[PDB]
Structure formats: C-alpha cells, structure tokens
RNA sequence: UGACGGCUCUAAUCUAU
DNA sequence: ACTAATAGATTAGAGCCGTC
C-alpha cells in the first residue's frame, strides 16, 4: 500500500578491521582479510594455452584503466591489491596437443566425447598430484572455446 | 555434456582446485566476428573482470578476500537447492544440495538428499520424514563439533514452500533452544514498482512487509555509491515469507541482504539471490553429472 | 576517483519521501456473493464450463458463475426451465475472512475458482475491444495492431515501434491473484511483429 | 563454465470438477 | 476402478540476450 520500507546494508570485513559495504572499492586500496604469500599455478591446453594465458598472466598485476571509475572502480594490479604474487613462475603446462584433443572430440556419441574429454584432463591433474612432487595450488584449465561451444549441453 | 560439472565431479576424491578457463574470454581482443569487430566486447569492464578472475584464483588458492562482521553468534544459514538427476536414467529421484554459514563468515557446503519417497519425476521437492533427521543433525552436528553446542537458530533458505510431512520429523532431533524458523526465497512472485520520475529503478534494499510473516526484499536494484542499478528493468523482489516458527520478519531482512555481498567468485556490488543457496546450487549440478562420489562437507576452493 | 572519494566510499543517499506507483492493480468493488448454480440435466452433463458467454466454473454437481442462471440462453437454450432456488449462493467477504468452512467447498479452494472465473475473464473484454492478441507460452498477451490507433501513438506515448523492418508492439498480460488482497497481475511484457500487421513465426 | 542479471522457451508436480 | 480430466499456485530447466 502507500509504505515502502527501506533495510540497512551490512558491511563486510576486511585488512586489519575495515568495514566497507561495497567488494571492490574495500578491496581495491584496504587488502583482503588473509596473506598467502604466492599463487603456485599451472596451465594445462593447447598451444595457444600458455600464450594467451602468459599475456594474460602478467596482464592482470599490471595496472589497466576502466572507462568509468565511479561504475568499474579502478585496479591498479594483483600485487598491489591482494598483497600477494602472480607472476609465470613454476608453471607446469600440461602438452594436450590439439591432435590428441582433436581425435576425442571428433567423436559420434556425445556422452563419450564429454568423458573421454575429462578423462583426458581429470587424470593429467591427479597424476601431477600423484606421481609427482610439483606442490600445485590452482589448475588453470584452458578449454579450447572450440570445445565449451560445441560440447555443451 | 556439461563436461564442466563432470571435470569436478570426478576430481572430489582427490580435491584438486580447479579454474575452468577460455581462450574466447582471455583473448576477446584475438576473437572477432566476420564483420570485423569482436564477438564479446569485454575489456570496458576490465575491472570487476579481473577481480573476478583473480578474486576467485584467490579463493581457489585458499584466499580470504573479505568475511561478515554483522552477524549474530549462533546462526546458521542453511540454504537448500533440489537438483534434477537427468543426467541419470530417470528424474524419479532428485538429490538436494544444502550449505551452511557460522558465525565466523567461513562458508561452508554440504551435499543434500535424495528424494526416496519423490512423488513422480518431479514431486513437492521435500526429503522424506526417514532422511529429514539425516540432513539437519549432520549440519547441526558440524556446527556442533566446532561450537560446542547447537545453534540458537538456523534459517532453513529455499525456493521451494516446505511441508509438516518434514517438519514434524525435523523436531524431535532439533532441541528446544534451535529456533527451527523456515524462510522460502521465491523470485517467482510478480511484485514491480517504478519511480515516477527519472529513468532508474528503484534503490536496492527498498522492501514492503505485506504481513507479521512474508516480506519482499529487493536484494537488486538501484544502489547509493556505483550509481548504476545491477539490472536493466526493474527486477521482481525477493519474496521471503517464514514457513514454520517464529521470528521477526524484520530481522530477517538484515540476513537475506547480507548474503548478497559475500560471493567467493565473483566482484560485483550483490547478489541478486541469496548466496546461501546460490552457492547451494552451486555443487547440485556439479555433483548431479556423476553419482560415484561420496564427498565430505567440502569447500568450495574446489567446485 | 579522486583516490575512491579519498578512500571513503560515502554512503551518498539522501532521506526524501519517494511516491512509486506498482505494477498491479487494486480491488474496488466485487458481487456481494457468487453463484453456484446446480444444473444437472439442465446443462449437459458431458460439456462443462467451457463454452458459456460468462465467465463460469464447474465444481461437484454445480456451476459456479458470478450471472444468474437465466444468463446462458444463447448457447444453452435449454435453461428455461430450470428452477432458480437450488442454486447456491456464498457471499464473497466470508470467503476472504475465513469463516466459509462447508463440507460443500472449502475456503482455500473457494479461493482459487474465483480467479479463475477473474483471470479469464479480461480475456473477454480485448475481444469487444479494438485489441487483437497472441498466445504466449504460458499466457496470453494482447498488442494493438500498426496503425489501428490514430497518428501511430495514443497519449503521445508509443504503443508501435520500428526496429529495422520489424515492429515492436507493448503487450500485457494480467493475472489474477488474491494473496496480499484481489489485485490485478498485470505485467510488462513486448512482442514484435514481421512488418506491424503480421507477427514474426 | 570469469561472474552478475533478466525474461523467454519448455517440462513436471499436488489441491479440488 | 480409474479411464482421463482444465484449470491455482509451484518447481527446475534449458536457451539465447546484455553486462553505461
């Protein structure tokens, strides 16, 4: 009817006691609320897997301009913001030629082709947590955009 | 063909972090159409695009980006999706997926349930009185374990309106200091309100309490300080009504908002849905494209 | 921004009484009580509720209707003879209160044929309208038509626009419902059309 | 499946002719 | 016996779309 109430918003936490309500604008100049001190990650795709991704990987602690602040706050990199590391250092990039994906994915059955294309990554990954002794800490999976736009449900 | 829900399915028993990338969506500069511009324009929000990628290679890397400091202490916000099991022979059953909040900001997730006694392919999306005693004391014993004793309450979050058939078996093992209240999220209720002048919708955090039990929050609309509403239109307000107990429907609007901020994998201003079962949802489909996994309460640095 | 308005991130809201007018559409009037007229032989037994002028219902061995008996002579001729005191009458405020609890019909239920006697009835008036329609998947919208209504724009706002070759028409789509109180659901909808006079398949 | 929207288009169920 | 019943008011789903 003629009433409309309006609640409160709650803050979040953040570095060392900051309570600022939005995400990225406390995160932005205030730090996040945990240190670790390195990103050990690994690339595992195509050729264009580690390219792509190393343009990217050192693209993102380089400071980039949005075309508006006051919408898209500013971010001036990923060391500067998350207090920590992320650099291509320690990559274990993973040789899953186009061949090798490209003779699953050239397959007639669709519940086959979205397996043996996990089975083909899913034991790449738990053999280098395996038979191995690289401490990884986040798997970047470059999937082809070839294959998410065609195996896709 | 989900092969992304099934890349996470089989790798739970080894609990692998994983972060799905695109060559489409890191060289959106190399992908253009065939009339000469790019498919997805996408470094104009190169903002929140990085944070979110980072953010979340943050949190896959066990990061704590922020955490809650209004919450109260003995609270739990139990958020359950029901998930269809088509990816099985037949959607007979459907397997739920619940998660679970303390009071020190540390989201948590559990699986859910099957549906034994599911009513046809898709019944009133309820878990059985037999299994009603299985889901809620292995969330009340995991905030036992590292509280001590039972919460003061938990908030049982849904879109689907619970039943006495459930409710009933879920007392006898819930004791008299749980205020076992019930609050159903429903996006599906067609509320709409304007502003007569100026062409931005309404502020988020507006809400009409039409009685003692229901409510409408609008956990999205217009917002104070980024000055651009995250929608276009204006969206339907969340209706949150409490199923069964007492409570005020008041206070209830401090918790649906303030699981909105909070989404470890993402850098926007809210959620436009509760996170306690947006993040629910978030394992349902994962763990529907295989169904081989016995998975402990897990994190999500993993899905 | 000026370091993030100086590391601040001020609040930025002012405390003004705001009007805003919703999306639905209150309840005025109403009959004092609704119908139930018990035809048996009178309507015939193997079509029910699906053909009459009014808006009507079926419910047990009875018609539920918001006219009167004597209403249906054009397409069921054979009323003439029915006798108008076995039909049941039900007054509409002691539904919405509660306190209407027969063995006959309950008042959860009472609820739900009354919209439905409401939410086909408006389908009815567009018709007598200068309002054509299309069928949604789950509703019915209703647009008006490209050049129908005078100088393209009715209140000198646009109901017709021109997107390349194809139009736009603003179509809405009503429901009843009574769980806050008897609104009007009407939503926002559009649709377009091939060329404003045929619709894009 | 960056991630957030939003409805469309389908499908299914219980409560009563 | 149910044979199906047309509707309330609910549910998860896949779709493309924008993402000032």
Not at chain 1, 32 to 47: A, D, E, F, Q, R
Not at chain 2, 280 to 288: N, P, R, V, W
């Given at each position: 009817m003629k009433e409309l109430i309006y609640i409160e918003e709650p803050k979040i936490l953040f570095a060392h006691g900051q309570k600022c309500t939005d995400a990225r604008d406390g995160l932005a100049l205030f730090?996040?609320?945990?240190?670790?001190?390195?990103?050990?990650?690994?690339?595992?795709?195509?050729?264009?897997?580690?390219?792509?991704?190393?343009?990217?990987?050192?693209?993102?602690?380089?400071?980039?301009?949005?075309?508006?602040?006051?919408?898209?706050?500013?971010?001036?990199?990923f060391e500067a913001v998350f207090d920590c590391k992320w650099e291509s250092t320690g990559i274990t990039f993973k040789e899953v030629t186009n061949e090798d994906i490209g003779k699953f994915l050239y397959n007639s059955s669709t519940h086959k082709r979205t397996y043996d294309l996990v089975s083909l990554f899913i034991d790449?990954?738990?053999?280098?947590?395996?038979?191995?002794?690289?401490?990884?800490?986040?798997?970047?999976?470059?999937?082809?955009?070839?294959?998410?736009?065609?195996?896709?449900? | 063909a989900q092969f992304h829900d099934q890349f996470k399915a089989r790798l739970l028993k080894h609990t692998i972090p994983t972060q799905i990338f695109r060559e489409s969506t890191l060289a959106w500069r190399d992908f253009k159409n065939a009339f000469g511009l790019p498919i997805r324009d996408f470094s104009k929000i190169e903002g929140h695009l990085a944070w979110t990628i980072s953010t979340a290679a943050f949190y896959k890397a066990g990061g704590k980006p922020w955490k809650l400091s209004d919450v109260r202490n003995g609270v739990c916000y139990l958020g359950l999706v029901y998930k269809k099991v088509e990816k099985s022979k037949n959607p007979r059953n459907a397997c739920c997926a619940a998660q679970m909040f303390l009071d020190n900001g540390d989201g948590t997730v559990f699986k859910g349930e099957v549906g034994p006694w599911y009513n046809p392919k898709n019944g009133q999306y309820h878990l059985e009185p037999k299994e009603?005693?299985?889901?809620?004391?292995?969330?009340?014993?995991?905030?036992?374990?590292?509280?001590?004793?039972?919460?003061?309450?938990?908030?049982?979050?849904?879109?689907?309106?619970?039943?006495?058939?459930?409710?009933?078996?879920?007392?006898?093992?819930?004791?008299?200091?749980?205020?076992?209240?019930?609050?159903?999220?429903?996006?599906?209720?067609?509320?709409?309100?304007?502003?007569?002048?100026?062409?931005?919708?309404?502020?988020?955090?507006?809400?009409?309490?039409?009685?003692?039990?229901?409510?409408?929050?609008?956990?999205?609309?217009?917002?104070?300080?980024?000055?651009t509403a995250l929608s276009m239109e204006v969206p339907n307000p969340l209706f949150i009504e409490i199923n069964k107990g007492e409570a005020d429907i008041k206070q209830v609007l401090?918790?649906?908002?303030?699981?909105?901020?909070?989404?470890?994998?993402?850098?926007?201003?809210?959620?436009?849905?509760?996170?306690?079962?947006?993040?629910?949802?978030?394992?349902?489909?994962?763990?529907?494209?295989?169904?081989?996994?016995?998975?402990?309460?897990?994190?999500?640095?993993y899905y | 921004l000026l370091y993030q308005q100086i590391f601040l991130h001020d609040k930025s809201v002012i405390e003004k009484e705001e009007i805003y007018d919703s999306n639905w559409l209150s309840i005025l009037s109403?009959?004092?009580?609704?119908?139930?007229?018990?035809?048996?032989?009178?309507?015939?037994?193997?079509?029910?509720?699906?053909?009459?002028?009014?808006?009507?219902?079926?419910?047990?061995?009875?018609?539920?209707?918001?006219?009167?008996?004597?209403?249906?002579?054009?397409?069921?001729?054979?009323?003439?003879?029915?006798?108008?005191?076995?039909?049941?009458?039900?007054?509409?405020?002691?539904?919405?209160?509660?306190?209407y609890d027969s063995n006959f019909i309950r008042n959860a239920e009472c609820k739900r044929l009354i919209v439905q006697l409401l939410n086909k009835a408006f389908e009815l008036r567009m018709k007598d309208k200068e309002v054509q329609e299309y069928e949604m998947s789950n509703?019915?919208?209703?647009?008006?038509?490209?050049?129908?209504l005078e100088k393209d724009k009715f209140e000198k706002t646009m109901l017709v626009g021109k997107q390349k070759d194809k139009n736009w028409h603003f179509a809405i789509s009503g429901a009843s419902k009574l769980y806050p109180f008897p609104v009007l659901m009407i939503s926002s909808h559009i649709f377009f059309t091939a060329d404003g006079k045929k619709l894009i398949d």
């Open positions: 730090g996040p609320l945990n240190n670790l001190y390195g990103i050990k990650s690994g690339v595992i795709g195509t050729k264009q897997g580690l390219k792509i991704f190393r343009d990217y990987l050192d693209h993102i602690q380089k400071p980039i301009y949005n075309s508006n602040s006051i919408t898209r706050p500013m971010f001036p990199g790449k990954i738990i053999s280098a947590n395996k038979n191995e002794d690289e401490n990884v800490d986040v798997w970047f999976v470059i999937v082809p955009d070839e294959i998410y736009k065609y195996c896709r449900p | 009603a005693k299985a889901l809620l004391s292995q969330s009340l014993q995991s905030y036992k374990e590292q509280i001590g004793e039972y919460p003061k309450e938990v908030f049982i979050h849904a879109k689907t309106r619970f039943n006495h058939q459930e409710w009933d078996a879920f007392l006898e093992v819930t004791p008299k200091e749980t205020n076992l209240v019930g609050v159903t999220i429903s996006k599906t209720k067609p509320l709409k309100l304007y502003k007569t002048e100026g062409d931005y919708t309404i502020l988020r955090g507006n809400a009409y309490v039409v009685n003692e039990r229901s409510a409408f929050l609008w956990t999205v609309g217009y917002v104070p300080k980024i000055q401090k918790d649906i908002l303030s699981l909105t901020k909070l989404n470890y994998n993402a850098c926007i201003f809210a959620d436009g849905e509760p996170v306690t079962l947006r993040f629910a949802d978030k394992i349902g489909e994962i763990l529907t494209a295989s169904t081989d996994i016995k998975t402990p309460p897990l994190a999500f640095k | 109403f009959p004092e009580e609704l119908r139930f007229h018990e035809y048996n032989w009178m309507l015939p037994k193997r079509f029910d509720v699906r053909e009459l002028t009014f808006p009507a219902v079926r419910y047990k061995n009875y018609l539920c209707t918001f006219a009167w008996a004597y209403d249906f002579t054009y397409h069921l001729p054979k009323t003439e003879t029915y006798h108008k005191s076995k039909t049941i009458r039900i007054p509409t405020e002691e539904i919405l209160s509660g306190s509703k019915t919208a209703y647009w008006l038509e490209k050049g129908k």
